[PDB]
Design a protein around this nucleic acid. Sequence first.
RNA 1: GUUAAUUCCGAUAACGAACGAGACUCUGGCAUGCUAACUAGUUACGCGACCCCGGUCGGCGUAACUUCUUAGAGGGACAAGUGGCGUUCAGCCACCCGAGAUUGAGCAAUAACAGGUCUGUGAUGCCCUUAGAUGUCCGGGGCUGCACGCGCGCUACACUGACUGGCUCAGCGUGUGCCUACCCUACGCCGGCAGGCGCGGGUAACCCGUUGAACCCCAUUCGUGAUGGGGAUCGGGGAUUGCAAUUAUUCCCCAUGAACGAGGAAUUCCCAGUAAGUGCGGGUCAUAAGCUUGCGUUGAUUAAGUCCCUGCCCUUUGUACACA
Lengths: 66, 141, 62, 57, 75, 142, 144, 57, 185, 100
Amino acid sequence: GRVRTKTVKKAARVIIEKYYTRLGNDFHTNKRVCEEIAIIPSKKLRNKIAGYVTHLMKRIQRGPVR
Amino acid sequence: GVTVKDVNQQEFVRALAAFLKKSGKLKVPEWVDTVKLAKHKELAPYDENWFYTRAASTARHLYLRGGAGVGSMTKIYGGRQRNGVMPSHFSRGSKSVARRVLQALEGLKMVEKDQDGGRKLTPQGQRDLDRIAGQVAAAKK
Amino acid sequence: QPIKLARVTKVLGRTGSQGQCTQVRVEFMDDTSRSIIRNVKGPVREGDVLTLLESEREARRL
Amino acid sequence: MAVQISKKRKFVADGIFKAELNEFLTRELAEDGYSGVEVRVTPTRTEIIILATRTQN
Amino acid sequence: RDKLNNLVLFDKATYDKLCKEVPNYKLITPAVVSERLKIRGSLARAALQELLSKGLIKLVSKHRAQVIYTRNTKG
Amino acid sequence: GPLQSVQVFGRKKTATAVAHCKRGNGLIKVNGRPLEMIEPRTLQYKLLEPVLLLGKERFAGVDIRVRVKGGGHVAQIYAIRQSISKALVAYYQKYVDEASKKEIKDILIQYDRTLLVADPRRCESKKFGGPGARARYQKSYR
Amino acid sequence: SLVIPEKFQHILRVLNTNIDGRRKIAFAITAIKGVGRRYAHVVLRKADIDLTKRAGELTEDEVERVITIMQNPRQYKIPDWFLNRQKDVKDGKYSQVLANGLDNKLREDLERLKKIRAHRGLRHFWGLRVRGQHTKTTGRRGRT
Amino acid sequence: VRRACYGVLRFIMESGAKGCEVVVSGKLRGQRAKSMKFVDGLMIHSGDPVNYYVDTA
Amino acid sequence: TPDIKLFGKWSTDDVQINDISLQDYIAVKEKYAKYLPHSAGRYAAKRFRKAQCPIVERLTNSMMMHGRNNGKKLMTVRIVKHAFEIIHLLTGENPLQVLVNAIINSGPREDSTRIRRQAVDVSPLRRVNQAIWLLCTGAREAAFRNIKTIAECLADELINAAKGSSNSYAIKKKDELERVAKSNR
Amino acid sequence: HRIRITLTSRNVKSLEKVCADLIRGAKEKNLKVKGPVRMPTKTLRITTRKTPCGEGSKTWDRFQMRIHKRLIDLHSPSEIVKQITSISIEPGVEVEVTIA
RNA sequence: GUUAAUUCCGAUAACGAACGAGACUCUGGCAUGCUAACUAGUUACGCGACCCCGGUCGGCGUAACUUCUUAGAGGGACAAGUGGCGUUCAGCCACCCGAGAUUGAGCAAUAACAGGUCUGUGAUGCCCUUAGAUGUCCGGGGCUGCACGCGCGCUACACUGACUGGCUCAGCGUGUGCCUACCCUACGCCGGCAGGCGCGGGUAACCCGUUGAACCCCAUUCGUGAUGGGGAUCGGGGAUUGCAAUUAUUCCCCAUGAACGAGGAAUUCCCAGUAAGUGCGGGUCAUAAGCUUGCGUUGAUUAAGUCCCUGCCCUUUGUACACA
Ligand SMILES: [Mg+2]
Ligand SMILES: [Mg+2]
Ligand SMILES: [Mg+2]
Ligand SMILES: [Mg+2]
Ligand SMILES: [Mg+2]
Ligand SMILES: [Mg+2]
Ligand SMILES: [Mg+2]
Ligand SMILES: [Mg+2]
Ligand SMILES: [Mg+2]
Ligand SMILES: [Mg+2]
Ligand SMILES: [Mg+2]
Ligand SMILES: [Mg+2]
Ligand SMILES: [Mg+2]
């Protein structure tokens, strides 16, 4: 039942659009660069956005995303 | 050798009951026979030499922790009162048998009235309980 | 009727009105190139052996 | 306090004080834009602040 | 319907029967001895304490629920 | 040498038991009394599982005194069962080699891994409209 | 030690009422009304009788001792609080009322309430719950 | 009633708010109990932010 | 130290589970060898991890039923201890072996279920469960209203189930259950 | 001279603001302090039927009031702590300073 | 297609939005790392008691420390890593690592019911009554009344048990009140018990209180008998609260010993610290839990499924239904 909602997915696409260079591959590093770069008012949402950033950046090193 | 906590307690109490019976110094009351030993009980005790046994038991409790009294010993010797067609509850022990047994264990000087209320056992009674703990360990070895 | 035991090789679905009898297909252990499909009652995973009282009853698949 | 009220009923007693203060000021100054109160205490005197719209009235 | 009229003390026949056969059993519980020898559980426990005291059977485990006894080793 | 004292907690349901292990001889006692009279004595090999699974040669130089508080009887006895093993594993953590730590740890885990990690389960809260945590009262029609 | 002794009484006779001897004495005395669990136990505590005996291996000396201790309780140092007919409303005598007199004292109390015409006597004669219970829902057994 | 609620809505949205909701319940246009509902803007309803975003009265 | 013995008295080798059918669902072997039938628990989180619990603890869990004995596990360990002892003196072999042969003998090979009815073969885990349950309920209602104590009801019925005499309540219900299955096949 | 301060509030963040402010005040007026000890939070819990009438599904509110209390010990004279407690307190926090 | 989800990927005459779900708050679980503690403690050290150097002590004091206790700030888990399945999208299964790889609640939209409340109000329209009062008060009674029917429950039908001793373990909480007169109690005596009489502590991490709670564990006695199961009914006495107990307020002591032998048609709640057993606190309260709300404690059988019955949501279709 782990479906990331639109407030996760939209924010993660905006993060990877404007900050693709500093984001990387591991959850713990790009978690804290996302926490530095955004105003995320809760740790749970912060972690879920960071994990979806990791997942679709693995998709980016697969190929281009829509 | 050993001390009271080093051995089993449930034959320690019958050893101390047999020791107080051997001394014969305890001064039981006259209403040992005609008593129900607490409110939550229903019968008299089956064992007729029970006063020496409860004296053993409360001497062991006062060895394990002091500053206890009538209300504390009723809190130890309380239990379930079944109220018939109502749910059962907890009920305290008898005040008078605790009072008489503390007066008897301070009659033969094994317990003594302390400061801050209650009883604490004397060094002579502590020495006797440690002696018979050694004797119980010797009987089980 | 001889007693033959057979190994579950794939679990396919649940059958029955109350959804109670897991339908699997098994293969017999002496005749390992042979298979049959049985409605099986209870907790079933893949890779356990059932004690078939007869080899020949074969049920439908929904 | 010499009668020495406990803290548990102390916080509900001054809570119920602030409640009836707010409701008293609600029943009186409803005509003149009573928004609320804020009650803040010091030693020997206590500042209670009515916060309303028409301060002139 | 049926009512077990178990006899509360030994008559001579059943006391001689308990001396005869009960030290040859494998399982000797008072619940077994009651059904095999027409007696109360209490009188069964007392008779089996007597047999243990005489030294004809053997204790295995004693508990607040039940006690279990064997016969001796024959060799 | 220096006093090599390690104080380790073991947690069951609410009964927490802190063990205290030093340099000494093989003295294992709990709340001022040895293991062989800790009621209920039905679970006597539950207390004996660390010492029977490891042997007294590993418990040789270590004396462990355990103080236990909370819960009920078997919750305390599981807290002692955890606390002895965790106290020995922390002594072998800090004062000897960690090859001994790893072999003591996987000998414990290949029997029972609740000797080290705890149960996070506690009694959950009673909601209203029922006699307990998720049972309800009897609904009746007609 | 465990065999039936001769003159084993399978029954006894106390106050024209049977005493089953196969049971144990502290529970065999209970068979007649007026004595129960605790009064039976205390009466044979006062009588020097071992509690492990069964009521058929007593002697007639001992059952005579027991019946005298039951019939004359308080002059064998049975306390006044241990009785059932404490301070009765005719002669004021603290005594234990037993088997054939027990229903007599009950029915005399009943007739006293009847001819006194009190509420509880009216409830008895009507055949109701006299001790203040509820009759709306419980107690449909005897009264239809 | 309707133009009063419209006036309160337009006034407080000019006063600057992400949304408002006015419910006037009672007997309006007759002796039947009707209800009137006036919503504009953003209005969260659930959760914890209704304790510090919704001012209610 | 090797050779963990159940209750300290019974070794966990010396047992052949004579089913290749019920092999992996009856746990008596060395990684499943405990000292007690008392563990911490938490076998009810996943589906089949019920079958990781050893058969002695699972018998002990399934005994303590019918209201007045819910969650008296220390008590049921006591009952299983006296029951294994009485099994040993009354039979002369391993009490765990008598338990395993009783499960193997008493598990119903097929049952009938409505898909009227239809005969269906049962899961090995379900026939383990139903075997344990029939053994426990036979011992329980043999003990009910009887001088015969349950700590030897369970023993005598594991003897009668390991011999399959149709003198056990378990073997009688197993026989009549697959009888009705043979009718509805 | 062993003068003690207790801070008690329904609020947690304002209380800990006041306690850390008093610690830094004691430090700038140069005297040692045994730290803010935290005694357990007292809950005042009320369960009432939500309904004014009797009917409905038998539902229950669960109201709570949390009370936090902390302690600060100071070996110091009196007017120092009197002038530090005359300033910098939130309205929610009750301060009680005793001498002995 | 996928998910707990109008949850997302995606299609696309729709685009861009709002509420609900989610997010959130409290709780639970994990930190030997941080902050610190005479209203919590540990370990040492020194005196003290006892046992034949060592051991026990919840015996007395102080030098370190905060693991245990308290509660603050941070952290911590994200389907993140791996292997499969899937448009290789959304996502699903399994496994290592792991304190956790679904803890439990609270909050909860649009629209609606002629659902409940005028007996919660000084929230209230209208009507009625208004000195022989439907206002208020006092005295007494009734709200309990018993041929009967139904519902929520407690006690049970016993040997997995009762009784009698012994042993040894909790967590919630509450506690001297505006009027308001009634608090929680250690301890010392008296009494079998209910209880009585004195000196003390506590407005509370201090005192009750280390909350010595029950089932439980151990050892007796009972023996399949409506039985030492069960304790209804009922007689007589003794206390407590009240201004007053009779229609027994509550409790105590003895005696009385009924139905009840596991419950027909039918029907309820529930899947993990869950069901059930067990006892303890709050409310009610002068007296007071067979109730309810919380709390621990012992603690499983079974299931990881289906639309079969009862229902819910979406799509298609049919309608002579629309108070449906
Ligand atoms: Mg007790
Ligand atoms: Mg929302
Ligand atoms: Mg939500
Ligand atoms: Mg039986
Ligand atoms: Mg209506
Ligand atoms: Mg008129
Ligand atoms: Mg009424
Ligand atoms: Mg009874
Ligand atoms: Mg009343
Ligand atoms: Mg009877
Ligand atoms: Mg239903
Ligand atoms: Mg009520
Ligand atoms: Mg048609």
